[PDB]
């Protein structure tokens, strides 16, 4: 249990058994996407990977191999990396499933280096946080290969497999790759050192900052600037010295990292000092990248109190600067993820019709993050939004960035077979490090598209799984005192009873938790009154 | 002593909160009028980018929104009507 292997296996069984992903949506998107547009082709691969996250269903890729074989360079890297999101949590066969795409140590493996690098990144996504068996294999793969694309996938895979383990030996191996000054491997190395050292406040953050001043490669500076921001996770006042150094820097890319460092230092605290500094930089800086990030960073400071975020961001959404309006859309998307707040939806609606294509892209993604798992019976606006997404995807005259946003939004709405939600806070009100970090890396998809797969880390399964003394799942029934239509799955392509008696092992949305009651006289009684998650049952018979 | 010691700050915080809200709203509206003016002005930048509009004088109208008017130097022609014209 403490290793997480049992909780992952039970989650994977739940996601496999309850997979209600609509393959017709993906078939429609595939037919509307022009075959020459590499961005829309990559967007459909990302949407497929998000829709089937942890369900092990690869049927769409198997049926469409002739369409996948048209992927070139980084689209082929992403195609292979997308298998890691689909097979997420499959710890035992994770190596055997990837074996055809892994670098075979003989001069006769006809793989493309993009597929081999993407397979190493896929292994890290499958074994995220649970790297004990694969850490050595990824280290040996990193040391054996001088190809930048394979090193890029190995670094990111190793950073995901070793997330928050503070392993010094993995740090020195990734640091040796950073000192090769390769523009693509160094961006991954920068992020991976940050992922390894999350929230340690190590003096090593000073070594990363020193190297960020020496390198001429903007990709390495950006990867290090985010990597430094990840080391500072959790640290509040201990971070202020390093944040003041990064924010007074001459380089706009280091100031951009300084805004993430402030966001990740003051995550979920709602601190007035941090909010005032972020709002100051959102207006005073000359760089639109710093301005966008300063507004986006408000979403990470304010997610503890999602009701305050629309009020603060409303004034920024009306700004003349499109980068600030984009940051405003994503700030609300991150803070209000899975809450369904009506104020947040009313603020995002105008931004979906913006003149600027990337503002529309941000608004569509943010709306999908807020509306994740919401039914048309709870809010009629979900039905209008799904028709709007379909319209944008079918239209030929729409901009490529707005289409990419609509495809990703459709993927996020139907994520994990409709059984996952984006959740920054645990039920215990602890910060989910993987979800905050996953969303902070995900927000950088403008510079590097393969970072889109980090959204998978922010997916929390919405399951009730009752377990016996032997850690097996018994069949038993429990009552929901709500109308079934509120917590139903959307219908496929073509007062009331309030005692929906579904099996205790079933999808339970956070809004449904208040209506769940155990039947007095059932064979199984919970040791603790918990309405969702893993609950141990006392057998009375 | 709890009634006269702890709960007393609830009746105090709200008084300042109410005035801060109004002052912030007034300042925000003052800034918002200006921001909207600036956004408009930048919109007129592209407004003057689009091609102009010709002048027309319909000599004869036709049912179902058909128009044949006098072009200044050219003449007349058969066209349709707009979306919000009686």
């Amino acid at each position: 249990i403490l290793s997480g292997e049992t909780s992952i296996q039970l989650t994977l069984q739940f996601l496999y058994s309850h997979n209600k992903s609509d393959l017709l949506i993906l078939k429609t998107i595939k037919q509307s996407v022009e075959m020459r547009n590499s961005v829309c082709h990559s967007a459909t691969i990302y949407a497929n990977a998000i829709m089937h996250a942890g369900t092990t269903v690869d049927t769409f890729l198997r049926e469409n191999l002739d369409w996948l074989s048209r992927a070139t360079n980084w689209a082929k890297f992403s195609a292979t990396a997308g298998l890691g999101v689909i097979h997420r949590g499959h710890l035992q066969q994770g190596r055997s499933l990837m074996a055809p795409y892994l670098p075979q140590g003989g001069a006769g493996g006809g793989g493309s280096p993009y597929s081999e690098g993407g397979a190493l990144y896929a292994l890290g996504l499958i074994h995220a946080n649970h790297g004990e068996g694969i850490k050595q294999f990824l280290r040996d793969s990193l040391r054996s290969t001088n190809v930048e694309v394979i090193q890029h996938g190995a670094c990111l895979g190793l950073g995901l497999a070793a997330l928050g383990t503070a392993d010094e030996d993995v740090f020195e191996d990734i640091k040796n790759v950073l000192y090769t000054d390769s523009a693509v491997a160094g961006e991954a190395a920068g992020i991976s050192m940050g992922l390894l050292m999350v929230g340690t406040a190590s003096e090593k953050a000073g070594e990363m900052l020193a190297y960020a001043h020496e390198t001429q490669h903007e990709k390495i500076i950006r990867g290090l600037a985010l990597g430094i921001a990840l080391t500072v996770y959790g640290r509040e006042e201990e971070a202020d010295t390093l944040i003041e150094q990064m924010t007074r820097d001459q380089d706009p890319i280091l100031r951009y990292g300084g805004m993430y460092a402030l966001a990740l230092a003051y995550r979920g605290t709602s601190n007035n000092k941090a909010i005032r500094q972020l709002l100051h930089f959102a207006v005073s800086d000359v760089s639109d990248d710093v301005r966008r990030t300063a507004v986006l960073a408000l979403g990470f400071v304010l997610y503890s109190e999602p009701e305050q975020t629309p009020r603060i961001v409303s004034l920024l959404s009306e700004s003349y600067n499109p980068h600030v309006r984009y940051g405003a859309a994503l700030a609300v998307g991150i803070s209000c993820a899975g809450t369904g707040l009506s104020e947040a939806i009313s603020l995002l609606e105008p931004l979906t019709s913006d003149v600027v294509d990337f503002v529309r892209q941000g608004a569509l993604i943010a709306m999908a993050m807020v509306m994740v798992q919401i039914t048309e019976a709870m809010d009629s606006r979900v039905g209008t939004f799904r028709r709007q997404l379909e319209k944008i995807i079918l239209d030929k005259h729409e901009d490529t960035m707005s289409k990419m946003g609509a495809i990703l939004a459709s993927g996020i709405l139907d994520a994990g077979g409709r059984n996952v939600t984006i959740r920054l806070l645990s039920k215990s009100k602890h910060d989910k490090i993987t979800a905050v970090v996953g969303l902070a890396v995900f927000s950088q998809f403008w510079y590097w598209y393969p970072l889109i797969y980090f959204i998978s880390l922010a997916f929390s399964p919405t399951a009730f799984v009752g377990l016996n003394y032997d850690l097996k799942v018994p069949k038993f029934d429990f009552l929901s005192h709500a109308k079934p239509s509120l917590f139903e799955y959307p219908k496929p392509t073509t007062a009331e009873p309030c005692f929906e008696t579904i099996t205790n092992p079933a999808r339970v949305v956070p809004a449904q938790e208040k209506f769940i009651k155990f039947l007095e006289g059932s064979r199984y009684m919970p040791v603790k009154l918990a309405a969702s998650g893993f609950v141990l049952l006392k057998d009375l018979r | 002593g709890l009634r006269q010691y702890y709960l007393q700050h609830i009746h105090e915080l709200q008084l300042r909160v109410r005035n801060k809200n109004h002052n912030l709203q007034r300042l925000e509206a003052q800034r918002n009028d200006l921001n909207s003016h600036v956004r408009a002005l930048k919109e007129e930048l592209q407004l003057l980018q689009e091609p102009g509009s010709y002048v027309g004088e319909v000599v004869k109208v036709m049912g179902k929104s058909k128009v044949l008017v006098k072009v200044h130097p050219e003449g007349k022609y058969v066209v349709d009507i707009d979306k919000n014209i009686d």
Partner: peptide, 30 residues
């Protein structure tokens, strides 16, 4: 709970307080 109404009221008031600097920043950037 009885002390919660005061603690929450203080939290919201403090949050609205930063709105002064927030507005002041735009009043000059605008």
């Amino acid at each position: 709970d009885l002390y919660g109404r005061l603690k929450s009221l203080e939290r919201q008031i403090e949050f609205k307080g930063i709105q002064e600097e927030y507005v002041k920043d735009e009043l000059k950037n605008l």
